[PDB]
């Protein structure tokens, strides 16, 4: 059961004497036992993709054929750790080796075996009680926040024969057993699941509840849904990573799984250094945000093939936690890197390029990655509800949104956040374009936003109208030179300037806009729209009769009120009370009303 | 260790461009170094690339010319490319391949190291925080650089980036002020003789030759060696960073020539292309080069890196600058408009970027309002450029007052903030005082970005 390395070139090798083999079967190569995978074959020859540096491998080295395709281990202890692209626990490696490198072909299990997790019985089962796939028969407390829950694997069912009592056990101790049809099979705390296979689910349900967002923009103007899709393409210098981190820190989701791909090392250094300090409570004590976050690091240098594995691994973990009834939120970084890794690999096989060298099937691969999402009714008796949201970050080469990868992405996603490098040159954080972006989910959420607020639709519509009309007037004021302006035109242009500078701008590090909840957004938009309405009504009435009000007149009338209006954003809601800011904005509206009455 | 004798060969199945193919090889090893003896007795080397069956392929480093099948001899060593490294290498000169130039002897080595190095574990990475004093206000003040950073410098043909690099070397230090210094390794990627003379003389001038290792590859040398030289220099840097606990600064120059050499070597194999004909995996290769930098837990040294590249035809979408902009976390963008106005040092700020500033500065590092000054100054600069572009059409009559304020701000800021001089080295606090001197021109009721508090406590004076 050993092949021999016929050839080697790049990360693609060849092995003869492998007639008894199958595609996508893992494989160990060389004396370091680098993990691999099968892609092609011809007779008793085969082609092995290698997930590790090939330097030093020699012809004729033994190659061990294993008995399973690519798989990922699931169970307690996954939370809070950081894994590389094929799921080696990095912290275990650094502890074991006492070094600062990653030796090639290091073999350490995905999870630890020498830890005793507390276990609780089902409290509802007995000897001879029948279950099926996806039924919970155990609860283990990883920590105060997230209570792990062990379910029977899919494709298994039967009447139980032994249940372990409550107490502290490790993985290796057999927990459950059962007979189905005269065969007794034992279940541990560990599931092994093929990575490229979807976890079955009862039924996909329609979306029913939105997804909170940190930033002021991209929340009112382009909402997201609890289970939907979103994309953030944009040229460099624009910093998609800041938005990704901001979303990661501040969101109502129960688990966050932030998969990096080809990222910078310093960015993972940010994440590791920074998340543990931030904290938040739910039903008592305050606990660090690291206690609800699982990371999958994969920086640029790491072997090219591993980039493929990492993304699939991450989404698989997301689905596994989805089978618990949580609301997972996932953050993919630079899927363009994944596409480019696939491009390189397919290049070294001597296959057909399709579009800019990208193989044809990348569109299908991308679509398959995203379609595993959405809110779903789960499979199991206890009747759990959960969802998975996916927000991926594309990196078009140079900002050209006609490149193949963005073109394939725009057809499949539902929400799109175009970003503009000019704004990022202005440091207009976040540098979103607000004119080519869109989001098809507005219609499904209007019902919610009415069942809570009922006073947002006019605000949004008027904001879109004013911005659109400003953009139309941009050409007319550019060519003319700001002379051929009726007073309403100047009013809309300058109120558009104020909304762009005030509501749209937001700093992503200063304490007072690290986070901004929805109500403040509503308050600010209401203030600005009301001011627009009053200004135009006054100017209309004074235009038709006599003494047409120029914009300079209202400016000199209430520049102080304008200054207060803009400085509204200095609040830091964390300390100050909500009703206090509501009364503050009501007071500013009172000031505006008084000024307009005095001018009236 | 290995006592196996080294086989020699006489099999040359055939030549095709820069490749040399061998046959009847007993167990070749991927990426093993091989020496070649030509009929004339002169010597060369190479590295295996593709192996299949008993056949193998060998990239020649010195350029293939004069290879005869029946008289050449191909000696094999049986290991990857491995280099000698020693602390005393500082204060020497070497060519691209590593052989001495300065009439000295080869390096008695303290250890052998892998040319490619090997990835560092992200968990044991101490994020860089400590700030460096460059002196240039366009960096300290706008795009500050902390040790461990790997920011590049973008230039164009016929621009004085060499002067900027030399000055950066001269005035490097620590803003927070035993006497600390630097150990600088410098590698050249096809510079002309004039550049080499300039850099060598400059390092001679300030007495810093005692602590600089040099790597020089003029255009005379065969292009294939340009692939290896960077990784060799970078390996030396890593040794001095983690085995001697020194603080090191790296300066690779004209990586555009490196990209050209990469294109040349790739075209021999007929790999798949990308934009402008470069290899697709060129991105991953540049990543293999650039990333090797930063500070690691449990140590004391650190690696800073300052690559320099020219922009062909000033086209910023060109693949080399783009992929550099993806990998590294910043840019500088030397301007040529200022060079046409005869200004020194002519550095644009509007497209420059420094990702590490968000933690480089703050209270207890430089000053309380360091970020605010930066934000407001950039904003005024941007609106000033916009107002100039507007003035180019409408005429002076259409200008409102704030246009005049922005234009005088633009002029004053350009002649004051940017212009420093060949050796003027401003302190950081002097730079902030000057920045506030430029901010005070505007009335306080227009500096939107700055918080109200900072304006209250600092603006009136």
């Amino acid at each position: 059961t050993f092949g021999y390395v016929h050839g080697v070139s790049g990360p693609v090798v060849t092995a003869c004497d492998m007639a008894g083999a199958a595609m996508y079967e893992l494989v160990r190569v060389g004396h370091s036992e680098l993990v691999g995978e099968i892609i092609r074959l011809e007779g008793d020859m085969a082609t092995i993709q290698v997930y590790e540096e090939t330097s030093g491998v020699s012809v004729g080295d033994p190659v061990l054929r294993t008995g399973k395709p690519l798989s990922v281990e699931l169970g307690p202890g996954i939370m809070g750790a950081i894994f590389d692209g094929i799921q080696r626990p990095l912290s275990d490696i650094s502890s074991q080796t006492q070094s600062i490198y990653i030796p090639r072909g290091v073999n350490v299990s995905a999870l630890s075996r020498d830890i005793k997790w507390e276990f609780i019985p089902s409290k509802n089962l007995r000897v001879g009680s029948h279950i099926t796939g996806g039924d919970i028969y155990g609860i283990v407390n990883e920590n105060s926040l997230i209570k792990h829950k062990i379910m029977l694997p899919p494709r298994n069912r039967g009447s139980v024969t032994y249940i372990a009592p409550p107490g502290n056990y490790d993985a290796s101790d057999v927990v459950l057993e059962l007979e189905f049809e005269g065969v007794k099979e034992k279940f541990s705390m560990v599931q092994v699941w093929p990575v490229r296979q979807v976890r079955p689910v009862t039924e996909k349900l329609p979306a029913n509840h939105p997804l909170l967002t940190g930033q002021r923009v991209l929340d009112a103007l382009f909402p997201c849904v609890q289970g939907g899709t979103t994309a953030i393409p944009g040229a460099f210098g624009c910093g998609k990573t800041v938005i990704s981190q901001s979303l990661s820190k501040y969101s109502n989701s129960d688990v966050i799984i932030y998969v990096g791909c080809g990222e910078r090392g310093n960015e993972m250094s940010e994440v590791l250094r920074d998340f543990p300090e931030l904290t938040m409570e739910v039903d008592g004590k305050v606990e660090s945000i690291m206690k609800r976050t699982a990371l999958v690091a994969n920086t640029s240098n790491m072997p090219v093939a591993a980039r493929e594995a990492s993304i699939y691994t991450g989404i698989t973990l997301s689905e596994y936690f989805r089978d618990m009834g949580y609301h997972v939120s996932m953050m993919a970084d630079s899927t363009s890197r994944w596409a480019e890794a696939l491009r390189e690999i397919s290049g070294r096989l001597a296959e057909m390029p399709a579009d800019s060298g990208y193989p044809a099937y990348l569109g299908a691969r991308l679509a398959s990655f995203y379609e595993r999402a959405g809110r779903v009714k789960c499979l199991g008796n206890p009747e759990r509800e959960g969802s998975v949201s996916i927000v991926g970050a594309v990196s078009p080469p140079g900002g050209d949104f006609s490149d193949p990868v963005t073109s394939a992405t725009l057809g499949i996603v539902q929400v799109f956040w175009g970003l503009d490098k000019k704004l990022a040159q202005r440091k207009h954080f976040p540098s979103v374009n607000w004119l080519i972006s869109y989001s098809k989910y507005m219609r499904a959420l209007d019902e919610y936003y009415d069942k809570h607020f009922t006073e947002f639709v006019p605000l949004r519509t008027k904001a879109k109208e004013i911005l659109q009309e400003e953009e139309d007037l941009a050409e007319i004021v550019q060519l003319v030179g700001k002379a051929s302006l009726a007073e309403t035109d100047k009013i809309t242009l300058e109120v558009a300037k104020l909304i762009k500078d005030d509501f749209l701008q937001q700093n992503g590090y200063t304490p007072y806009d690290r986070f901004c909840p929805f109500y403040k957004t509503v308050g600010m938009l209401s203030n600005m729209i009301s001011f627009y309405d009053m200004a135009r009504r006054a100017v209309e009435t004074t235009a038709q009769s006599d003494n047409k009000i120029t914009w300079s007149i209202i400016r000199e009338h209430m520049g102080e009120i304008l200054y207060k209006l803009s400085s509204m954003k200095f609040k830091d809601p964390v300390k100050d009370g909500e009703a206090k800011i509501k009364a503050d904005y009501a007071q500013l509206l009172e000031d505006m009303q008084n000024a307009f009455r005095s001018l009236e | 260790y290995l006592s196996q004798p080294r086989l020699t060969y006489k099999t040359v199945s055939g030549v095709n461009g820069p490749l040399v193919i061998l046959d009847h090889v007993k167990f070749p090893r991927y990426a093993e170094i091989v020496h070649l003896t030509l009929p004339d007795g002169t010597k060369r080397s190479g590295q295996v690339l593709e192996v299949s069956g008993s056949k193998a392929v060998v990239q020649v480093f010195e350029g293939t010319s004069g290879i005869d099948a029946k008289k050449t001899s191909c000696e094999f060593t049986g290991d990857i490319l491995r280099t000698p490294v020693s602390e005393d290498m500082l204060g020497r000169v070497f060519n691209g391949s590593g052989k001495p130039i300065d009439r000295g002897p080869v390096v008695l080595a303290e250890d052998f190291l892998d040319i490619m190095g090997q990835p560092i574990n992200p968990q044991c990475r101490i994020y860089p925080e400590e700030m460096i004093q460059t002196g240039i206000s366009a960096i300290d003040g706008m795009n500050s650089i902390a040790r461990g950073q790997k920011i590049p410098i973008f230039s164009a043909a016929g621009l004085p980036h060499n002067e900027i690099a030399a000055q950066i070397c001269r005035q490097a230090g620590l803003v927070k002020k035993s006497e600390e210094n630097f150990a600088i390794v410098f590698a050249a990627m096809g510079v002309n003789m004039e550049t080499a003379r300039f850099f060598k003389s400059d390092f001679e001038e300030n007495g810093s030759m005692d602590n600089v290792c040099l790597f020089l590859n003029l255009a005379n040398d065969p292009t294939i060696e340009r692939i290896i030289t960077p990784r060799l220099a970078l390996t030396t840097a890593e040794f001095l960073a983690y085995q001697c606990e020194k603080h090191v600064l790296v300066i690779l120059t004209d990586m555009s020539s490196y990209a050209e050499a990469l294109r040349e070597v790739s075209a021999a194999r007929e790999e798949v292309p990308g934009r402008r004909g470069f290899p697709g995996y060129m991105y991953t290769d540049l990543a293999t080069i650039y990333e090797r930098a930063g500070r690691v837990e449990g140590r004391n040294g650190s690696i800073t890196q300052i690559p320099i590249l020219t922009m062909p035809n000033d086209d910023i979408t060109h693949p080399i600058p783009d992929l550099t902009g993806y990998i590294t976390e910043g840019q500088i963008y030397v301007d040529r408009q200022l060079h046409n106005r005869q200004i020194y040092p002519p550095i644009n700020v509007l497209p420059s970027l420094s990702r590490l500033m968000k933690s480089a500065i703050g209270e207890g590092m430089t000053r309380k309002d360091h970020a605010d000054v930066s934000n407001q100054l950039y904003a005024c600069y941007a609106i000033g450029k916009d107002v100039q572009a507007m003035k180019a059409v409408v005429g002076e009559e259409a200008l409102t007052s704030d246009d005049l304020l922005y234009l005088e701000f633009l002029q004053k800021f350009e002649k004051n903030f940017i212009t420093q001089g060949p050796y003027e080295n401003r302190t950081v606090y002097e730079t902030l005082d000057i920045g506030w001197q430029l901010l005070r021109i505007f009335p306080k009721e227009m500096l939107k970005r700055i918080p109200q508090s900072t304006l209250s406590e600092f603006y009136p004076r």
Binding site: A350, M352, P353 | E270, V272, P273
Partner: peptide, 13 residues
Amino acid sequence: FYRLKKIQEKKKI
């Protein structure tokens, strides 16, 4: 151009 070249090369076998 390149893809045609690769067809040409493949046809040699």
